[PDB]
């Protein structure tokens with residue numbers, strides 16, 4: 001029963017994992033290896049998936065990250081989460097899976113809508129995702145969320161939550177803004193979030209303490225907000241120099257040129273390359289961090305999906321333990337490394 005160390009909002013989704021024939025991907029016009037939102041002609045994909053013996057597992061980006069936090073903290077209610085679900089069987093299945101892990105949650109029910117669902121299709125060593133948000137889009141942060149989250153100083157939201165309404169993440173970040181030890185953290189989530197919610201994200205970033213994102217997301221952020229010269233907008237982030245310039249430019253979106261005692265940090269994951277981060281220190285000087293990623297044979301990599309969510313989960317767990325920025329990144333790396341070496345988006349039992 002607490003204490004709650006991290007509170008997050010997200011799109012609660014039930015992942016349906018199953019191996020399928022290539023004719024399946026072809027029949028539903030899917031391209032192997034891509035993650036997309038279900039099209040009108042793919043609405044029967046979930047019911048059709050049933051004939052392939054699907055495994056139901058809790059999903060959703062933010063939910064995956066807080067489950068990592070909860071697993072590491074162990075005490076029931078160590079992490080809290082809010083999102084919306086439907087009034088269907090699938091919603092009950094998701095809620096049960098979360099309760100047994102000890103996560104503190106409050107799922108808002110949307111009558112008549114279906115709980116978020118993601119088809120994780122395994123074919124030819126690749127993962128193809130097809131997501132249908134459903135009820136997730138109806139989520140509206142309840143007025144008493146601060147009471148539900150009592151005690152937590154670390155708040156987290158994915159840019160994916162902007163698809164319901166950017167007001168949810170703005171309200172959470174607004175609560176943390178100005179309070180020196182209150183930390184709001186955000187994930188860029190996907191390239192389309194950066195473009196589609198340009199202005200809402202710009203405002204949200206001013207209220208952000210820590211920003212997480214991968215290379216592709218940051219490249220889009222840099223282009224939309226003109227963080228670097230047009231001549232550099234296409235340079236490879238696999239180049240330390242360019243990655244650092246992008247991170248340093250993005251940091252300005254959080255600092256607005258001002259300096260307080262509050263945390264202001266941008267973290268860029270770069271696949272197998274070292275994680276790069278730009279941090280505004282106590283006196284306002286900017287310091288760059290480079291944390292190498294432990295090598296892992298390509299033969300031991302099962303799937304990179306979920307690595308990002310696990311990384312964030314680890315980072316936040318470490319942060320709640322008061323670890324340094326480098327230590328937080330290393331923990332995120334350890335969690336990400338565990339998840340990519342086996343089926344599923346959760347940490348191994350033995351971890």
Ligand SMILES: CSc1ncnc2c1ncn2[C@@H]1O[C@H](CO)[C@@H](O)[C@H]1O
Nearest residue numbers: 011013059060061118131160163306
């Ligand atoms: C706004 S679209 C969206 N929002 C939040 N999470 C998403 C979305 N699409 C897929 N997922 C989740 O990504 C997890 C793997 O990273 C998978 O668990 C999958 O459920």
Ligand SMILES: CSc1ncnc2c1ncn2[C@@H]1O[C@H](CO)[C@@H](O)[C@H]1O
Nearest residue numbers: 269271272293296307308311333336
């Ligand atoms: C050979 S590919 C590879 N090798 C080792 N680790 C990987 C790799 N790809 C991703 N990671 C880990 O996932 C984090 C980003 O989610 C990355 O920051 C990193 O921690």
Ligand SMILES: [Cl-]
Nearest residue numbers: 010011061062
């Ligand atoms: Cl999410």
Ligand code: NA
Nearest residue numbers: 260280281282
């Ligand atoms: Na500072």
Ligand code: NA
Nearest residue numbers: 339342343344
């Ligand atoms: Na995995």
